[PDB]
Amino acid sequence: SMPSDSSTELTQTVLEGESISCFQVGGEKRLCLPQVLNSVLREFTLQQINTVCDELYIYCSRCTSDQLHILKVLGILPFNAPSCGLITLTDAQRLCNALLRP
């Protein structure tokens, strides 16, 4: 099958030596934002993370209710989680570039 055939297949991809969970949405791998923020970019404040995102025009979006629930059953998010952001692989890599290697 093609990657675009489903947006509900949880896959994993490497980011800064970290294995981040992902869905394919609108033709791009999109990473579970909480994993990127609270693990890969934990050594930077949310104020600074958001400042960089505004600067580099990082387009963050929210998971569907289907995607939210899959992330819970497959053990990535706590079941109480009301929502989850997604970041494209390409935006995650260039966000990481800006913060970890200025």
Side-chain angles (χ1 to χ4, degrees), residues 3-4 6-7 23-30 67 88:
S4 296
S6 175
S7 73
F23 294 101
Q24 195 79 10
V25 183
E28 288 177 292
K29 283 190 194 169
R30 311 213 189 199
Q67 283 153 356
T88 63

PDB file of all heavy atoms in Angstrom, residues 3-4 6-7 23-30 67 88:
ATOM      1  N   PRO A   3       1.798   5.197   1.385  1.00  0.00           N
ATOM      2  CA  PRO A   3       1.706   5.937   2.652  1.00  0.00           C
ATOM      3  C   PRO A   3       0.445   6.792   2.775  1.00  0.00           C
ATOM      4  O   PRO A   3      -0.137   6.883   3.857  1.00  0.00           O
ATOM      5  CB  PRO A   3       2.945   6.837   2.629  1.00  0.00           C
ATOM      6  CG  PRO A   3       3.896   6.159   1.749  1.00  0.00           C
ATOM      7  CD  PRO A   3       3.099   5.407   0.727  1.00  0.00           C
ATOM      8  N   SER A   4       0.028   7.401   1.667  1.00  0.00           N
ATOM      9  CA  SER A   4      -1.177   8.227   1.639  1.00  0.00           C
ATOM     10  C   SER A   4      -2.484   7.441   1.813  1.00  0.00           C
ATOM     11  O   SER A   4      -3.540   8.049   2.001  1.00  0.00           O
ATOM     12  CB  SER A   4      -1.247   9.014   0.327  1.00  0.00           C
ATOM     13  OG  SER A   4      -0.179   9.934   0.228  1.00  0.00           O
ATOM     14  N   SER A   6      -3.495   5.684   4.266  1.00  0.00           N
ATOM     15  CA  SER A   6      -4.017   5.787   5.622  1.00  0.00           C
ATOM     16  C   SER A   6      -3.363   6.916   6.401  1.00  0.00           C
ATOM     17  O   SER A   6      -2.168   7.195   6.242  1.00  0.00           O
ATOM     18  CB  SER A   6      -3.816   4.472   6.381  1.00  0.00           C
ATOM     19  OG  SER A   6      -4.214   4.616   7.736  1.00  0.00           O
ATOM     20  N   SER A   7      -4.171   7.554   7.243  1.00  0.00           N
ATOM     21  CA  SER A   7      -3.700   8.556   8.196  1.00  0.00           C
ATOM     22  C   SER A   7      -3.875   8.052   9.626  1.00  0.00           C
ATOM     23  O   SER A   7      -3.761   8.823  10.575  1.00  0.00           O
ATOM     24  CB  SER A   7      -4.486   9.857   8.017  1.00  0.00           C
ATOM     25  OG  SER A   7      -5.803   9.728   8.525  1.00  0.00           O
ATOM     26  N   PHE A  23       1.994   9.875  12.128  1.00  0.00           N
ATOM     27  CA  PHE A  23       0.943   9.542  11.158  1.00  0.00           C
ATOM     28  C   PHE A  23       1.296  10.205   9.827  1.00  0.00           C
ATOM     29  O   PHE A  23       1.990  11.218   9.803  1.00  0.00           O
ATOM     30  CB  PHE A  23      -0.425  10.084  11.585  1.00  0.00           C
ATOM     31  CG  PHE A  23      -0.971   9.460  12.831  1.00  0.00           C
ATOM     32  CD1 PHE A  23      -0.894  10.123  14.050  1.00  0.00           C
ATOM     33  CD2 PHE A  23      -1.572   8.214  12.787  1.00  0.00           C
ATOM     34  CE1 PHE A  23      -1.398   9.555  15.198  1.00  0.00           C
ATOM     35  CE2 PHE A  23      -2.078   7.639  13.942  1.00  0.00           C
ATOM     36  CZ  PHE A  23      -1.990   8.316  15.149  1.00  0.00           C
ATOM     37  N   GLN A  24       0.805   9.648   8.725  1.00  0.00           N
ATOM     38  CA  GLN A  24       0.900  10.312   7.424  1.00  0.00           C
ATOM     39  C   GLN A  24      -0.363  11.146   7.216  1.00  0.00           C
ATOM     40  O   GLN A  24      -1.453  10.599   7.133  1.00  0.00           O
ATOM     41  CB  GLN A  24       1.052   9.288   6.306  1.00  0.00           C
ATOM     42  CG  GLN A  24       1.511   9.882   4.981  1.00  0.00           C
ATOM     43  CD  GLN A  24       3.012  10.168   4.921  1.00  0.00           C
ATOM     44  OE1 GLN A  24       3.780   9.761   5.796  1.00  0.00           O
ATOM     45  NE2 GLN A  24       3.430  10.875   3.875  1.00  0.00           N
ATOM     46  N   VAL A  25      -0.215  12.468   7.158  1.00  0.00           N
ATOM     47  CA  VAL A  25      -1.354  13.369   6.959  1.00  0.00           C
ATOM     48  C   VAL A  25      -1.066  14.382   5.857  1.00  0.00           C
ATOM     49  O   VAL A  25      -0.071  15.106   5.911  1.00  0.00           O
ATOM     50  CB  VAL A  25      -1.713  14.142   8.244  1.00  0.00           C
ATOM     51  CG1 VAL A  25      -2.937  15.012   8.005  1.00  0.00           C
ATOM     52  CG2 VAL A  25      -1.951  13.182   9.399  1.00  0.00           C
ATOM     53  N   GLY A  26      -1.952  14.434   4.866  1.00  0.00           N
ATOM     54  CA  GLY A  26      -1.783  15.317   3.710  1.00  0.00           C
ATOM     55  C   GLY A  26      -0.429  15.196   3.027  1.00  0.00           C
ATOM     56  O   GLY A  26       0.161  16.200   2.647  1.00  0.00           O
ATOM     57  N   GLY A  27       0.076  13.971   2.898  1.00  0.00           N
ATOM     58  CA  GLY A  27       1.295  13.707   2.130  1.00  0.00           C
ATOM     59  C   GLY A  27       2.614  13.949   2.845  1.00  0.00           C
ATOM     60  O   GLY A  27       3.664  14.000   2.204  1.00  0.00           O
ATOM     61  N   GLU A  28       2.574  14.095   4.166  1.00  0.00           N
ATOM     62  CA  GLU A  28       3.793  14.274   4.963  1.00  0.00           C
ATOM     63  C   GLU A  28       3.719  13.489   6.263  1.00  0.00           C
ATOM     64  O   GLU A  28       2.637  13.345   6.837  1.00  0.00           O
ATOM     65  CB  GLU A  28       4.002  15.755   5.287  1.00  0.00           C
ATOM     66  CG  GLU A  28       4.438  16.596   4.106  1.00  0.00           C
ATOM     67  CD  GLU A  28       4.574  18.066   4.456  1.00  0.00           C
ATOM     68  OE1 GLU A  28       3.536  18.710   4.727  1.00  0.00           O
ATOM     69  OE2 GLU A  28       5.719  18.578   4.455  1.00  0.00           O
ATOM     70  N   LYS A  29       4.869  12.983   6.714  1.00  0.00           N
ATOM     71  CA  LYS A  29       4.992  12.399   8.045  1.00  0.00           C
ATOM     72  C   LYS A  29       4.809  13.520   9.057  1.00  0.00           C
ATOM     73  O   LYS A  29       5.484  14.552   8.979  1.00  0.00           O
ATOM     74  CB  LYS A  29       6.378  11.755   8.274  1.00  0.00           C
ATOM     75  CG  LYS A  29       6.609  10.392   7.619  1.00  0.00           C
ATOM     76  CD  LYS A  29       7.913   9.752   8.117  1.00  0.00           C
ATOM     77  CE  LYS A  29       8.342   8.578   7.252  1.00  0.00           C
ATOM     78  NZ  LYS A  29       9.734   8.104   7.547  1.00  0.00           N
ATOM     79  N   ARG A  30       3.909  13.309  10.011  1.00  0.00           N
ATOM     80  CA  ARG A  30       3.678  14.274  11.079  1.00  0.00           C
ATOM     81  C   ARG A  30       3.886  13.636  12.457  1.00  0.00           C
ATOM     82  O   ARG A  30       3.289  12.613  12.778  1.00  0.00           O
ATOM     83  CB  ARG A  30       2.287  14.888  10.939  1.00  0.00           C
ATOM     84  CG  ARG A  30       2.014  15.380   9.524  1.00  0.00           C
ATOM     85  CD  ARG A  30       1.124  16.613   9.483  1.00  0.00           C
ATOM     86  NE  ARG A  30       0.724  16.923   8.113  1.00  0.00           N
ATOM     87  CZ  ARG A  30       0.265  18.101   7.695  1.00  0.00           C
ATOM     88  NH1 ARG A  30       0.132  19.129   8.532  1.00  0.00           N
ATOM     89  NH2 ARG A  30      -0.068  18.255   6.422  1.00  0.00           N
ATOM     90  N   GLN A  67      -6.899   9.717  15.529  1.00  0.00           N
ATOM     91  CA  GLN A  67      -5.449   9.740  15.789  1.00  0.00           C
ATOM     92  C   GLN A  67      -5.135   9.864  17.275  1.00  0.00           C
ATOM     93  O   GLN A  67      -4.227   9.204  17.776  1.00  0.00           O
ATOM     94  CB  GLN A  67      -4.769  10.876  15.028  1.00  0.00           C
ATOM     95  CG  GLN A  67      -4.573  10.585  13.544  1.00  0.00           C
ATOM     96  CD  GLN A  67      -4.523  11.843  12.679  1.00  0.00           C
ATOM     97  OE1 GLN A  67      -4.706  12.959  13.171  1.00  0.00           O
ATOM     98  NE2 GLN A  67      -4.276  11.660  11.381  1.00  0.00           N
ATOM     99  N   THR A  88       5.162  18.424  11.245  1.00  0.00           N
ATOM    100  CA  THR A  88       5.734  17.689  10.109  1.00  0.00           C
ATOM    101  C   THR A  88       7.207  17.361  10.374  1.00  0.00           C
ATOM    102  O   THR A  88       7.905  18.117  11.047  1.00  0.00           O
ATOM    103  CB  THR A  88       5.619  18.464   8.783  1.00  0.00           C
ATOM    104  OG1 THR A  88       6.374  19.679   8.863  1.00  0.00           O
ATOM    105  CG2 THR A  88       4.167  18.783   8.465  1.00  0.00           C
TER     106      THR A  88
END
